[PDB]
Amino acid sequence: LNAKVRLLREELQLLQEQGSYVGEVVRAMDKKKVLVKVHPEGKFVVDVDKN
Amino acid sequence: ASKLPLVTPHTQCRLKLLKLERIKDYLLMEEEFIRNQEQMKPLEEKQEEERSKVDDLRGTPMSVGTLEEIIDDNHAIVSTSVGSEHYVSILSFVDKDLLEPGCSVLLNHKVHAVIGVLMDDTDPLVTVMKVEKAPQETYADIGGLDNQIQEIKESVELPLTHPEYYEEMGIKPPKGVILYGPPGTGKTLLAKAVANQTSATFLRVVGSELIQKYLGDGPKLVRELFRVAEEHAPSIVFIDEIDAIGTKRYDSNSGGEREIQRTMLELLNQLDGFDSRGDVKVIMATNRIETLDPALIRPGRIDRKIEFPLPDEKTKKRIFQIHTSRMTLADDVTLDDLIMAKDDLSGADIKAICTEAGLMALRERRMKVTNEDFKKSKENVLYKKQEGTPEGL
Numbered sequence: 484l485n486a487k488v489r490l491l492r493e494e495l496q497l498l499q500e501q502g503s504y505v506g507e508v509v510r511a512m513d514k515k516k517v518l519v520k521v522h523p524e525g526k527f528v529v530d531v532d533k534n
Numbered sequence: 535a536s537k538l539p540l541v542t543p544h545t546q547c548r549l550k551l552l553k554l555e556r557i558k559d560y561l562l563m564e565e566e567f568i569r570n571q572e573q574m575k576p577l578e579e580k581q582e583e584e585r586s587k588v589d590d591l592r593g594t595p596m597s598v599g600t601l602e603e604i605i606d607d608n609h610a611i612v613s614t615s616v617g618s619e620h621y622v623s624i625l626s627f628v629d630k631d632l633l634e635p636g637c638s639v640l641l642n643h644k645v646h647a648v649i650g651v652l653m654d655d656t657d658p659l660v661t662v663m664k665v666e667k668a669p670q671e672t673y674a675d676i677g678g679l680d681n682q683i684q685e686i687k688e689s690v691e692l693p694l695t696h697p698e699y700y701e702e703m704g705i706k707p708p709k710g711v712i713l714y715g716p717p718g719t720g721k722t723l724l725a726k727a728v729a730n731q732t733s734a735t736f737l738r739v740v741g742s743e744l745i746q747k748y749l750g751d752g753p754k755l756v757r758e759l760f761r762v763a764e765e766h767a768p769s770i771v772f773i774d775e776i777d778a779i780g781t782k783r784y785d786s787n788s789g790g791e792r793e794i795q796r797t798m799l800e801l802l803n804q805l806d807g808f809d810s811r812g813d814v815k816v817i818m819a820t821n822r823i824e825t826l827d828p829a830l831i832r833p834g835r836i837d838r839k840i841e842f843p844l845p846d847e848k849t850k851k852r853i854f855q856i857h858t859s860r861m862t863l864a865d866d867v868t869l870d871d872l873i874m875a876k877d878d879l880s881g882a883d884i885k886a887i888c889t890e891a892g893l894m895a896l897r898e899r900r901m902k903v904t905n906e907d908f909k910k911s912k913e914n915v916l917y918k919k920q921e922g923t924p925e926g927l
């Protein structure tokens with residue numbers, strides 16, 4: 484119960500963090516970069532997180 | 535690799551040995567110098583961290599634009615995905631030999647400077663048109679052409695195989711070849727054989743594919759077919775069944791005839807016009823050559839004109855053997871009896887005879903083809919004659 488309450492108390496400031504775009508991967512390339520189509524915008528050559 | 539242009543006599547000569555020995559000596563000097571300097575200090579760390587500075591300069595979220603115009607002063611107009619266009623600076627680490635209008639460039643996120651170019655798909659029309667290795671077969675299958683094979687080789691193969699012979703005499707190779715003959719003699723067969731035996735991008739188009747349904751698309755198709763023929767190094771463009779697009783060009787016609795004429799004019803210009811044609815060789819086949827345009831088959835357009843005659847007496851035996859090679863036969867086959875008749879038989883007719891004989895043997899369940907089977911198949915094949923007996927004779 485205490486964990487539930489604590490999570491619901493920090494969730495207010497956890498919910499103001501910016502979302503993340505959802506894109507479609509075209510093909511991996513280069514050192515560690517990727518080519519992604521972020522609809523409705525154009526494509527990007529983005530990095531990849533270490534994980 | 536951007537090496538010196540020898541431009542010595544260009545024929546095996548002592549001057550060309552000396553210029554070449556000099557290049558080898560200089561290259562040996564460079565190799566020794568680089569090896570010794572690498573041993574003294576790797577310089578790998580120095581080579582690295584320049585890439586790190588470059589990656590710092592080009593931010594993480596590189597955007598893909600579309601180059602529109604180069605102002606020729608390390609500046610450009612680049613269009614973003616939304617449609618907006620920006621006047622930016624082409625930075626120094628981008629290989630400018632790749633930049634051309636319409637290319638997919640990589641743009642900086644904040645400053646939109648050009649910081650790279652992306653590779654592009656490889657099928658404008660190449661995958662559709664190119665034939666790869668001809669599935670039919672190599673030169674072995676073709677039987678009884680011989681002289682025609684030699685002419686085709688002297689036209690398309692020899693220039694790529696031994697060009698010194700031409701460069702010595704100073705003559706450029708003959709421009710193009712047109713293969714003409716009655717239906718079923720081996721024009722397409724020879725074209726496919728040279729396609730599979732050659733080392734150049736071979737493109738095949740049937741004239742009926744140039745009769746498009748929308749205005750200007752036939753001309754656009756020919757323009758693009760020759761456009762992706764200089765982009766692919768040595769190439770051979772084989773326009774089979776030219777008779778569909780080329781014709782006497784009678785002015786008094788209406789309908790799609792005008793559009794076909796315009797397509798033919800565009801093809802004429804591509805074959806020989808204001809611009810140099812680069813290194814592209816053209817082959818054309820036509821059952822009916824008498825109806826073509828003199829402008830289309832004038833000497834400077836098509837130099838060589840090869841005639842394909844119907845097999846007479848021994849070419850017939852050769853085709854029969856070639857097409858019955860992979861087929862078990864009973865020891866009673868009178869192939870000579872089959873061919874002896876002067877029935878104007880064509881090679882396609884022989885192939886049909888063999889295939890139908892095999893098919894009817896299969897139908898009867900037998901394990902071997904018989905002479906009677908071959909005779910009945912030949913009779914069935916020759917049943918497709920038609921026409922009127924007394925008429926014309």
Ligand SMILES: Nc1ncnc2c1ncn2[C@@H]1O[C@H](COP(=O)(O)OP(=O)(O)OP(=O)(O)O)[C@@H](O)[C@H]1O
Pocket residue numbers: 675676677678679715716717718719720721722723724819820821853856880881882885
């Ligand atoms: N001399 C030959 N040797 C082997 N096969 C032959 C010969 N002549 C014709 N053929 C056979 O004819 C078949 C029909 O294709 P081919 O290339 O011969 O036609 P074509 O002469 O170009 O005819 P068309 O003018 O109608 O286009 C080929 O599959 C080939 O098997």
Ligand SMILES: [Mg+2]
Pocket residue numbers: 721722774775819
């Ligand atoms: Mg043909």
